[PDB]
Amino acid sequence: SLRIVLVGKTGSGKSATANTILGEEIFDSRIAAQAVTKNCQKASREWQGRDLLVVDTPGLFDSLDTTCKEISRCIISSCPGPHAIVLVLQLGRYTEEEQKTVALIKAVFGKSAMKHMVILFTRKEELEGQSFHDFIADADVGLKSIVKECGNRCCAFSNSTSKAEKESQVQELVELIEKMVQCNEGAYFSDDIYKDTEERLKQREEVLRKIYTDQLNEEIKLVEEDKHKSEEEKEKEIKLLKLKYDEKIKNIREEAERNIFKDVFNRIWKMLSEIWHRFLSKC
Ligand SMILES: Nc1nc2c(ncn2[C@@H]2O[C@H](COP(=O)(O)OP(=O)(O)NP(=O)(O)O)[C@@H](O)[C@H]2O)c(=O)[nH]1
Numbered sequence: 343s344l345r346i347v348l349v350g351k352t353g354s355g356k357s358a359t360a361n362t363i364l365g366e367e368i369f370d371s372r373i374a375a376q377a378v379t380k381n382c383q384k385a386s387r388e389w390q391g392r393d394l395l396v397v398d399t400p401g402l403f404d405s406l407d408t409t410c411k412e413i414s415r416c417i418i419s420s421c422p423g424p425h426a427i428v429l430v431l432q433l434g435r436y437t438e439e440e441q442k443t444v445a446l447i448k449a450v451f452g453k454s455a456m457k458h459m460v461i462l463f464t465r466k467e468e469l470e471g472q473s474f475h476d477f478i479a480d481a482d483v484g485l486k487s488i489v490k491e492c493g494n495r496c497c498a499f500s501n502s503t504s505k506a507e508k509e510s511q512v513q514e515l516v517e518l519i520e521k522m523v524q525c526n527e528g529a530y531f532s533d534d535i536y537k538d539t540e541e542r543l544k545q546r547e548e549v550l551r552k553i554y555t556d557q558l559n560e561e562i563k564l565v566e567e568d569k570h571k572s573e574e575e576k577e578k579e580i581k582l583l584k585l586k587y588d589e590k591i592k593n594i595r596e597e598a599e600r601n602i603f604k605d606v607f608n609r610i611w612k613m614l615s616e617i618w619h620r621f622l623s624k625c
Protein backbone atom coordinates (compact mmCIF):
# COMPACT_ATOMS: atom_id res chain seq x y z
CA SER A 343 0.00 0.00 0.00
CA LEU A 344 1.14 3.52 -0.87
CA ARG A 345 -0.21 6.73 0.60
CA ILE A 346 0.65 9.79 -1.47
CA VAL A 347 -0.41 13.35 -0.93
CA LEU A 348 -0.54 15.93 -3.69
CA VAL A 349 0.00 19.47 -2.47
CA GLY A 350 0.69 22.61 -4.46
CA LYS A 351 -0.62 25.85 -5.88
CA THR A 352 -4.02 26.25 -7.51
CA GLY A 353 -3.93 25.44 -11.21
CA SER A 354 -0.73 23.44 -11.03
CA GLY A 355 -2.35 20.28 -12.37
CA LYS A 356 -2.75 18.37 -9.10
CA SER A 357 -6.08 16.86 -10.08
CA ALA A 358 -4.81 16.00 -13.56
CA THR A 359 -1.78 14.38 -11.93
CA ALA A 360 -4.10 12.41 -9.66
CA ASN A 361 -6.07 11.24 -12.69
CA THR A 362 -2.94 10.04 -14.50
CA ILE A 363 -1.99 8.11 -11.38
CA LEU A 364 -5.45 6.60 -11.04
CA GLY A 365 -5.69 5.48 -14.67
CA GLU A 366 -9.11 7.06 -15.14
CA GLU A 367 -10.55 10.51 -14.37
CA ILE A 368 -12.09 10.70 -10.91
CA PHE A 369 -11.34 14.20 -9.69
CA ASP A 370 -12.30 17.38 -11.50
CA SER A 371 -9.58 18.77 -13.78
CA ARG A 372 -10.26 21.82 -15.95
CA ILE A 373 -9.07 25.36 -16.59
CA ALA A 374 -10.59 27.94 -14.30
CA ALA A 375 -10.44 31.44 -12.89
CA GLN A 376 -11.58 29.86 -9.61
CA ALA A 377 -10.44 26.99 -7.44
CA VAL A 378 -11.86 23.83 -9.00
CA THR A 379 -10.99 21.75 -5.92
CA LYS A 380 -12.47 23.23 -2.77
CA ASN A 381 -12.15 20.06 -0.70
CA CYS A 382 -9.60 17.38 0.17
CA GLN A 383 -10.41 14.30 -1.91
CA LYS A 384 -9.14 10.71 -1.80
CA ALA A 385 -9.23 7.66 -4.08
CA SER A 386 -7.63 4.25 -4.67
CA ARG A 387 -6.22 2.28 -7.61
CA GLU A 388 -5.42 -1.31 -8.51
CA TRP A 389 -1.79 -1.33 -9.62
CA GLN A 390 0.82 -3.81 -10.79
CA GLY A 391 1.60 -4.66 -7.18
CA ARG A 392 -0.03 -2.19 -4.77
CA ASP A 393 -3.12 -0.21 -3.84
CA LEU A 394 -2.31 3.41 -4.58
CA LEU A 395 -4.06 6.02 -2.43
CA VAL A 396 -4.06 9.55 -3.80
CA VAL A 397 -4.95 12.62 -1.77
CA ASP A 398 -5.84 15.63 -3.92
CA THR A 399 -5.84 18.93 -2.07
CA PRO A 400 -7.30 22.36 -2.76
CA GLY A 401 -4.78 24.92 -3.99
CA LEU A 402 -2.83 25.93 -0.91
CA PHE A 403 -2.89 29.66 -1.51
CA ASP A 404 -5.73 31.63 -3.08
CA SER A 405 -7.72 32.21 5.40
CA LEU A 406 -6.29 30.75 8.61
CA ASP A 407 -9.57 28.94 9.09
CA THR A 408 -9.74 27.36 5.63
CA THR A 409 -6.05 26.44 5.57
CA CYS A 410 -6.44 24.77 8.96
CA LYS A 411 -9.54 22.92 7.76
CA GLU A 412 -8.00 21.51 4.61
CA ILE A 413 -4.66 20.65 6.22
CA SER A 414 -6.46 18.83 9.03
CA ARG A 415 -8.57 16.98 6.48
CA CYS A 416 -5.39 16.10 4.60
CA ILE A 417 -3.78 14.78 7.79
CA ILE A 418 -6.77 12.56 8.64
CA SER A 419 -6.94 11.11 5.12
CA SER A 420 -3.20 10.48 5.12
CA CYS A 421 -3.15 8.63 8.46
CA PRO A 422 -1.27 6.85 9.85
CA GLY A 423 1.18 8.69 7.61
CA PRO A 424 1.93 9.49 3.95
CA HIS A 425 4.63 7.69 2.00
CA ALA A 426 5.27 10.56 -0.37
CA ILE A 427 4.34 14.21 -0.20
CA VAL A 428 4.40 15.39 -3.78
CA LEU A 429 4.76 19.11 -4.39
CA VAL A 430 3.18 19.88 -7.75
CA LEU A 431 4.46 22.74 -9.92
CA GLN A 432 3.78 23.91 -13.42
CA LEU A 433 6.88 23.57 -15.57
CA GLY A 434 9.43 26.34 -14.93
CA ARG A 435 10.18 28.55 -11.91
CA TYR A 436 9.79 27.74 -8.22
CA THR A 437 7.58 30.57 -7.08
CA GLU A 438 6.40 32.37 -3.95
CA GLU A 439 3.20 30.36 -3.43
CA GLU A 440 5.21 27.13 -3.56
CA GLN A 441 7.76 28.77 -1.23
CA LYS A 442 5.03 29.46 1.35
CA THR A 443 3.61 25.97 0.76
CA VAL A 444 7.00 24.40 1.48
CA ALA A 445 7.29 26.74 4.46
CA LEU A 446 3.92 25.48 5.74
CA ILE A 447 4.74 21.76 5.50
CA LYS A 448 8.04 22.52 7.26
CA ALA A 449 6.31 24.56 9.96
CA VAL A 450 3.47 22.18 10.75
CA PHE A 451 5.09 18.80 10.15
CA GLY A 452 8.68 19.76 10.95
CA LYS A 453 11.76 19.81 8.74
CA SER A 454 11.71 16.03 9.10
CA ALA A 455 8.98 15.92 6.44
CA MET A 456 11.34 16.99 3.65
CA LYS A 457 12.77 13.49 3.34
CA HIS A 458 9.43 12.34 1.98
CA MET A 459 8.84 15.27 -0.36
CA VAL A 460 9.15 14.78 -4.11
CA ILE A 461 8.91 17.51 -6.73
CA LEU A 462 6.58 16.89 -9.66
CA PHE A 463 6.18 19.14 -12.68
CA THR A 464 3.27 19.21 -15.11
CA ARG A 465 3.15 20.25 -18.79
CA LYS A 466 6.16 18.04 -19.62
CA GLU A 467 5.20 18.20 -23.29
CA GLU A 468 5.87 21.95 -23.32
CA LEU A 469 9.69 21.84 -23.22
CA GLU A 470 9.87 20.28 -26.71
CA GLY A 471 13.46 19.62 -27.82
CA GLN A 472 14.98 20.24 -24.39
CA SER A 473 15.84 17.44 -21.92
CA PHE A 474 14.25 17.49 -18.46
CA HIS A 475 17.84 17.04 -17.23
CA ASP A 476 18.85 20.08 -19.25
CA PHE A 477 15.77 21.74 -17.76
CA ILE A 478 16.69 21.29 -14.09
CA ALA A 479 20.29 22.09 -14.99
CA ASP A 480 19.42 25.66 -15.97
CA ALA A 481 17.49 26.12 -12.74
CA ASP A 482 17.89 28.85 -10.13
CA VAL A 483 19.11 29.07 -6.56
CA GLY A 484 15.70 28.47 -5.02
CA LEU A 485 14.68 25.56 -7.24
CA LYS A 486 18.14 24.00 -6.83
CA SER A 487 17.84 24.49 -3.08
CA ILE A 488 14.46 22.79 -2.72
CA VAL A 489 15.49 20.00 -5.10
CA LYS A 490 18.51 19.47 -2.85
CA GLU A 491 16.29 19.31 0.26
CA CYS A 492 14.05 16.82 -1.51
CA GLY A 493 16.96 14.52 -2.31
CA ASN A 494 17.02 15.17 -6.06
CA ARG A 495 13.59 13.61 -6.45
CA CYS A 496 11.99 15.25 -9.50
CA CYS A 497 9.49 14.28 -12.20
CA ALA A 498 7.79 15.76 -15.22
CA PHE A 499 4.27 14.75 -16.27
CA SER A 500 2.29 15.02 -19.48
CA ASN A 501 -1.47 14.94 -18.91
CA SER A 502 -3.21 15.04 -22.30
CA THR A 503 -0.61 12.10 -24.51
CA SER A 504 -1.19 8.33 -24.49
CA LYS A 505 -1.96 5.87 -21.69
CA ALA A 506 1.29 3.95 -22.17
CA GLU A 507 3.36 7.10 -21.71
CA LYS A 508 1.18 8.09 -18.75
CA GLU A 509 1.42 4.72 -17.01
CA SER A 510 5.17 4.76 -17.66
CA GLN A 511 5.34 8.07 -15.78
CA VAL A 512 3.39 6.28 -13.07
CA GLN A 513 6.12 3.61 -13.04
CA GLU A 514 8.70 6.36 -12.61
CA LEU A 515 6.82 8.08 -9.79
CA VAL A 516 5.91 4.94 -7.85
CA GLU A 517 9.41 3.45 -8.17
CA LEU A 518 11.18 6.61 -7.01
CA ILE A 519 8.71 6.83 -4.11
CA GLU A 520 9.58 3.26 -3.13
CA LYS A 521 13.26 4.16 -3.47
CA MET A 522 12.77 7.19 -1.23
CA VAL A 523 10.82 5.24 1.40
CA GLN A 524 13.38 2.42 1.47
CA CYS A 525 16.22 4.91 1.96
CA ASN A 526 13.92 6.49 4.57
CA GLU A 527 14.18 3.44 6.85
CA GLY A 528 11.34 1.68 5.05
CA ALA A 529 8.35 3.36 6.71
CA TYR A 530 5.73 6.05 6.16
CA PHE A 531 6.01 9.58 7.52
CA SER A 532 5.30 9.80 11.25
CA ASP A 533 4.90 13.00 13.24
CA ASP A 534 3.73 14.10 16.70
CA ILE A 535 0.53 15.09 14.93
CA TYR A 536 0.25 11.85 13.00
CA LYS A 537 0.83 9.71 16.11
CA ASP A 538 -1.81 11.54 18.14
CA THR A 539 -4.29 11.86 15.27
CA GLU A 540 -3.92 8.15 14.50
CA GLU A 541 -4.36 7.18 18.15
CA ARG A 542 -7.57 9.19 18.23
CA LEU A 543 -8.64 7.49 14.99
CA LYS A 544 -8.01 4.02 16.44
CA GLN A 545 -9.70 4.87 19.73
CA ARG A 546 -12.89 6.08 18.03
CA GLU A 547 -12.95 3.15 15.58
CA GLU A 548 -12.78 0.63 18.44
CA VAL A 549 -15.49 2.67 20.16
CA LEU A 550 -17.78 2.52 17.11
CA ARG A 551 -17.08 -1.23 17.04
CA LYS A 552 -18.39 -1.37 20.61
CA ILE A 553 -21.42 0.68 19.51
CA TYR A 554 -22.33 -1.19 16.32
CA THR A 555 -21.88 -4.64 17.87
CA ASP A 556 -23.99 -3.79 20.92
CA GLN A 557 -26.62 -2.47 18.51
CA LEU A 558 -26.62 -5.72 16.50
CA ASN A 559 -26.53 -8.03 19.53
CA GLU A 560 -29.58 -6.19 20.90
CA GLU A 561 -31.62 -6.24 17.70
CA ILE A 562 -30.81 -9.97 17.54
CA LYS A 563 -31.90 -10.48 21.17
CA LEU A 564 -35.40 -9.18 20.45
CA VAL A 565 -35.82 -11.59 17.53
CA GLU A 566 -34.69 -14.63 19.51
CA GLU A 567 -36.99 -14.32 22.51
CA ASP A 568 -39.77 -12.91 20.33
CA LYS A 569 -42.67 -15.33 20.06
CA HIS A 570 -45.57 -15.31 17.58
CA LYS A 571 -42.94 -15.10 14.82
CA SER A 572 -42.08 -18.07 12.62
CA GLU A 573 -38.51 -19.36 12.83
CA GLU A 574 -38.12 -18.48 9.16
CA GLU A 575 -39.14 -14.91 10.04
CA LYS A 576 -36.55 -14.85 12.82
CA GLU A 577 -33.89 -16.17 10.44
CA LYS A 578 -34.77 -13.82 7.58
CA GLU A 579 -34.71 -10.81 9.92
CA ILE A 580 -31.43 -11.73 11.61
CA LYS A 581 -29.85 -12.48 8.22
CA LEU A 582 -30.78 -8.99 6.97
CA LEU A 583 -29.60 -7.43 10.23
CA LYS A 584 -26.24 -9.17 9.92
CA LEU A 585 -26.07 -7.90 6.33
CA LYS A 586 -26.70 -4.32 7.45
CA TYR A 587 -24.10 -4.88 10.17
CA ASP A 588 -21.44 -6.08 7.70
CA GLU A 589 -22.26 -3.00 5.62
CA LYS A 590 -21.95 -0.80 8.70
CA ILE A 591 -18.43 -2.01 9.56
CA LYS A 592 -17.31 -0.94 6.10
CA ASN A 593 -18.49 2.50 7.16
CA ILE A 594 -16.42 3.01 10.32
CA ARG A 595 -13.36 4.50 8.63
CA GLU A 596 -15.17 7.38 6.93
CA GLU A 597 -17.31 8.02 10.02
CA ALA A 598 -14.25 7.97 12.29
CA GLU A 599 -12.40 10.47 10.09
CA ARG A 600 -15.32 12.87 10.53
CA ASN A 601 -15.38 12.75 14.34
CA ILE A 602 -11.82 13.89 14.99
CA PHE A 603 -11.88 16.85 12.57
CA LYS A 604 -12.61 19.62 15.05
CA ASP A 605 -10.12 18.19 17.55
CA VAL A 606 -7.19 18.09 15.12
CA PHE A 607 -8.41 21.40 13.69
CA ASN A 608 -8.19 22.95 17.14
CA ARG A 609 -4.75 21.43 17.73
CA ILE A 610 -3.51 22.74 14.38
CA TRP A 611 -5.25 26.05 15.08
CA LYS A 612 -3.41 26.47 18.39
CA MET A 613 -0.14 25.90 16.54
CA LEU A 614 -0.87 27.82 13.33
CA SER A 615 -2.38 31.04 14.76
CA GLU A 616 1.00 32.22 16.13
CA ILE A 617 2.82 31.20 12.97
CA TRP A 618 0.57 32.89 10.40
CA HIS A 619 2.62 36.12 10.61
CA ARG A 620 5.01 34.24 8.30
CA PHE A 621 2.43 33.52 5.62
CA LEU A 622 0.71 36.90 5.33
CA SER A 623 0.85 38.69 1.97
CA LYS A 624 2.41 41.89 3.35
CA CYS A 625 1.70 44.83 1.00
N1 LIG B 1 -0.64 20.49 -21.32
C1 LIG B 1 -0.88 20.15 -20.05
N2 LIG B 1 -1.85 20.76 -19.39
C2 LIG B 1 -1.96 20.30 -18.13
C3 LIG B 1 -1.23 19.32 -17.49
N3 LIG B 1 -1.67 19.15 -16.19
C4 LIG B 1 -2.64 20.01 -16.06
N4 LIG B 1 -2.86 20.74 -17.20
C5 LIG B 1 -3.86 21.78 -17.43
O1 LIG B 1 -3.95 22.59 -16.28
C6 LIG B 1 -5.33 22.90 -15.98
C7 LIG B 1 -5.54 22.81 -14.49
O2 LIG B 1 -5.88 21.47 -14.14
P1 LIG B 1 -6.31 21.07 -12.67
O3 LIG B 1 -5.96 19.64 -12.48
O4 LIG B 1 -7.73 21.44 -12.51
O5 LIG B 1 -5.45 21.89 -11.72
P2 LIG B 1 -5.64 21.78 -10.22
O6 LIG B 1 -4.30 21.63 -9.61
O7 LIG B 1 -6.64 20.72 -9.98
N5 LIG B 1 -6.32 23.10 -9.70
P3 LIG B 1 -7.07 23.06 -8.31
O8 LIG B 1 -6.09 22.44 -7.34
O9 LIG B 1 -7.47 24.49 -8.03
O10 LIG B 1 -8.34 22.27 -8.48
C8 LIG B 1 -6.19 21.93 -16.78
O11 LIG B 1 -7.19 22.63 -17.52
C9 LIG B 1 -5.24 21.18 -17.71
O12 LIG B 1 -5.59 21.35 -19.08
C10 LIG B 1 -0.20 18.67 -18.21
O13 LIG B 1 0.56 17.78 -17.83
N6 LIG B 1 -0.09 19.16 -19.51
Ligand SMILES: [Mg+2]
Nearest residue numbers: 356357378379
Ligand atom coordinates in the same frame (compact mmCIF):
# COMPACT_ATOMS: atom_id res chain seq x y z
MG1 LIG C 1 -7.96 20.06 -7.94
